[PDB]
Each structure stands twice: as structure tokens, then as C-alpha cells.
Write a protein that binds this ligand. Structure first.
Ligand SMILES: Nc1nc2c(ncn2[C@@H]2O[C@H](COP(=O)(O)OP(=O)(O)O)[C@@H](O)[C@H]2O)c(=O)[nH]1
Ligand SMILES: [Mg+2]
Length: 412
């Protein structure tokens, strides 16, 4: 029947708070995103909801589209044609969402801009998310008009107009607008069809060296003491490129922090892949797409606290520079994140202490020199630079709190 494969596409869900991202994700997948549980909390709150997509050939559209191995909803006893498993990226925070997208933490091959039909468009967060979408160059964008139930058939009209006008003269000039109610499960199939049409699975260079982004780490082992029965540490993450295998030898970068009297260094952590799993199904290899769990032979202490948070996984023999001093070609956002006002950002200065997030990593840095849009930065925690223009997000000290001011590309 329907096979069991890992997800092959990451689709980000963006849009202003209370507009219905989580509800939309639940509509498509049937999963309520976690782990926010009770509102709480540098841990990366990110929900990964998965589902398979299929087409009921014997049905017409959009009803032919299903997420379960049945076509009964269409009226056929045939089995649907499996297409692909999808992974959705959802966030509890607007700040968290911006930091994830701008730092290259939330790898997405396309996205979904959630827009409430009951609020004036575009809301501030909708704008900022749009700029974010543009910057990281996700062009496969579906704009979703949500909450169409609490609005007259003619108010969504006005909204659509506003959207299409907002997009004219931009790259999103031709991106579609699909109206639905996430809450009432209305016209969701159409959105699946659209997801199939405008957000296609990209070609992936199987040759490139394997890189995993560690977005979490932990200890599976239970409270009752195993006593030598202990399962090794598990690392959760997203694979950027290439493939990892079971039993494959890998290393964690930068790795273990060592301090020899004011002498700060990092030693790569070497281990073997004991297991791979997406969801609750086990696998043999792991490619880009979706959130993976990697069973290792690590001592569960090294991984217990999301301790290897902000790290990178590569093959053990891979030549990846772990840099202490980096160069960034940066840009300043027009608005400080989540702030109401205008041009309240000064370009980067001399001895300034910043907070840089490169991927899942977060470290303090000091600017040593600054050209125009070219800054040299010295870090308290080095960064594994696995490609040329990997991205970072920049925060400076304002009023006793870290505030995102810009973003940039690392250059070597
Ligand atoms: N009337 C209506 N309400 C909705 C719809 N979708 C979500 N809501 C409500 O909006 C609130 C915010 O939903 P949520 O999914 O948490 O939004 P997000 O996570 O901020 O995108 C929830 O209390 C829902 O009850 C919709 O399609 N119609
Ligand atoms: Mg939510």
C-alpha cells in the first residue's frame, strides 16, 4: 500500500499571531503543534507536523487529494496514488519565527503566508514575515486567506484586492491566494492541491557532503534507573544536504567546550549513528526534509539538556572550518523586530557587543572592524562554516534586552 518514507519537503507556515497558523497545520495534518504546552520560555520552540499526500485518481479535484490511504471521501474504493510526505514548520513566537528564518535554522523549501480575513492586511508581523520570506529567497509561496467563515463573502474580496496590490511590483506578484477556514475545515483540499502545484520537491544534490543542523538534543532514558541498560544520547535536527546512514561515523561541531585557565577551546565530538527515526518509524538513511531523530552512542550527559544545541553534524572525515573570527556582509532591517516605529537603527559600530545566531547556534560576539556593510566579528563560541554564504541573524543591546537589528552572510 502506501509506503513509509521520510518527509522530503519542508513547508514553513508564517503569518501574524491569532491568524491561524497552528489551526491550519492541524487542519492539514491532524496534529496540534508542540511543545508549547503551557506557554513557557535558548530552546527552539518549533512544531513539525507531518502528513502524506496522495491523489485519488478516480476522483476529480480538489477532492481527489487526501492525507490518508483511502479515497472514500471522494467516493472510490481504489487506493490513492502516494505522492510524498510533507513536513510543516510552525512556531509559537513571532520573534522565534524571525530568528529561525533569518539564521537558517528553519530550513524551508517553500512557505505558506497565513492572512486573517478579519484583520486589516497587512498586519505588522505579516509584513515582517513577508520581508523575511523575500530575504531568504523562498519563492514558492502560497498565500492563504484564513478565517473566511467570520467574514462576508465580499470582505474576502476586498482583502484579496489588497493582497494582489501589495504584491504588485514585487517578486510575490504572481503568488496565489487560497481562501479557507482552518477552524471549520473548509476548502482545505484546494490548499493541498496548491501545495502540490506551487511548492514542488526541489532537486537535491545527493553528492554534496552530509550536513545536519542540530535543533535539539536529549536523553531518552527513563527516570527509573536502567543501570547499564542505558540508551545513548539522541540528537534532533534538520539535514541541509547529502545523506546520513546508520552505523556511519560522524562528528559534532564545534563540539565539547574545554577551558584551561582562561584558554577557551572546542573539541569535535565523535560518534556513530545507532539509529535514525522520523516520527515514530525507524529508518536506515536520512536525507533533507523533515525533523530527524538520530540515536547515537553518546553519553546521554553530553546530550541531556539540549546541550549540543546550536551544533552541526557532519561525517567524521569532513573538512569543515570551525571559525573563531568571521566576516559578515550584513544588512539592516528597516524596523527593529516587533517594534512599532520607523528608522530607529544605527549601523554597526566599533567595540559593540552583539548576539549572533548562525543556524541553531547562539553566541556573543564583538565587532573588531567594520567597512561599509562588511563587519569582522570575534566570537565567544566558534561557528562551523560548512558553505560560503551561510546566514546569521544579528541582535544588539537595547534598553537592557537583546533586539534583532539585522542579518548577514558569513564570508570565507
Ligand atoms: N472563526 C475562525 N476562527 C479561527 C480560524 N482559525 C483560527 N481561529 C481562531 O483563532 C485563534 C488563533 O488560532 P491559532 O491557530 O492559535 O493561531 P496562530 O497559532 O497564532 O496562527 C484560535 O483561538 C482559533 O479559535 C478560522 O478559520 N475561523
Ligand atoms: Mg501557534
Amino acid at each position: 500500500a502506501w509506503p513509509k518514507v521520510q518527509p522530503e519537503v519542508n513547508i514553513g507556515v508564517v503569518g501574524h499571531v491569532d491568524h491561524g497558523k497552528t489551526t491550519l497545520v492541524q487542519a492539514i495534518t491532524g496534529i496540534w503543534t508542540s511543545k508549547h504546552s503551557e506557554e513557557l520560555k535558548m530552546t527552539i520552540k518549533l512544531g513539525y507536523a507531518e502528513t502524506n499526500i496522495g491523489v485519488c485518481e478516480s476522483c476529480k479535484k480538489p477532492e481527489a487529494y487526501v492525507t490518508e490511504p483511502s479515497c472514500k471521501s471522494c467516493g472510490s474504493d481504489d487506493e490513492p496514488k502516494f505522492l510524498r510526505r510533507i513536513s510543516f514548520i510552525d512556531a509559537p513566537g513571532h520573534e522565534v519565527l524571525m530568528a529561525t528564518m533569518l539564521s537558517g535554522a528553519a530550513l524551508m523549501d517553500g512557505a505558506i503566508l497565513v492572512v486573517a480575513a478579519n484583520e486589516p492586511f497587512p498586519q505588522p508581523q505579516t509584513r515582517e514575515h513577508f520581508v523575511a520570506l523575500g530575504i531568504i529567497g523562498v519563492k514558492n509561496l502560497i498565500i492563504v486567506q484564513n478565517k473566511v467563515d467570520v467574514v462576508s463573502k465580499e470582505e474576502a474580496l476586498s482583502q484579496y484586492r489588497q493582497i494582489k496590490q501589495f504584491t504588485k511590483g514585487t517578486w510575490a506578484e504572481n503568488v496565489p491566494i487560497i481562501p479557507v477556514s482552518a477552524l471549520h475545515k473548509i476548502n482545505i483540499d484546494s490548499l493541498i492541491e496548491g501545495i502540490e502545484e506551487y511548492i514542488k520537491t526541489p532537486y537535491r544534490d545527493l553528492s554534496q557532503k552530509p550536513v545536519m543542523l542540530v535543533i535539539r538534543s536529549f536523553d531518552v532514558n527513563k527516570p527509573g534507573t536502567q543501570f547499564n541498560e542505558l540508551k545513548g544520547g539522541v540528537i534532533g535536527g534538520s539535514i541541509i544536504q547529502g545523506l546520513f546512514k546508520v552505523d556511519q561515523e560522524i562528528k559534532v561541531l564545534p563540539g565539547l567546550r574545554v577551558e584551561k585557565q582562561g584558554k577557551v577551546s572546542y573539541e569535535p565530538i565523535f560518534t556513530k549513528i545507532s539509529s535514525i527515526r522520523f516520527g515514530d518509524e525507524e529508518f536506515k538513511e536520512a536525507k533533507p526534509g523533515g525533523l530527524v531523530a538520530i540515536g547515537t552512542y553518546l553519553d546521554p550527559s553530553l546530550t541531556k539538556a539540549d546541550n549540543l544545541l546550536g551544533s552541526i553534524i557532519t561525517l567524521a572525515d569532513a573538512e569543515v572550518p570551525v571559525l573563531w573570527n568571521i566576516r559578515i556582509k550584513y544588512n539592516l532591517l528597516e524596523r527593529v523586530v516587533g517594534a512599532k516605529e520607523m528608522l530607529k537603527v544605527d549601523p554597526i559600530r566599533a567595540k559593540e557587543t552583539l548576539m549572533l545566531s548562525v543556524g541553531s547556534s547562539t553566541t556573543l560576539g564583538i565587532v573588531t572592524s567594520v567597512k561599509k556593510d562588511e563587519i569582522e566579528v570575534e566570537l565567544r563560541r566558534p561557528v562551523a562554516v560548512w558553505s560560503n554564504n551561510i546566514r546569521t541573524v544579528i541582535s544588539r543591546q537595547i534598553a537592557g534586552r537583546w533586539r534583532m537589528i539585522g542579518w548577514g552572510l558569513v564570508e570565507i
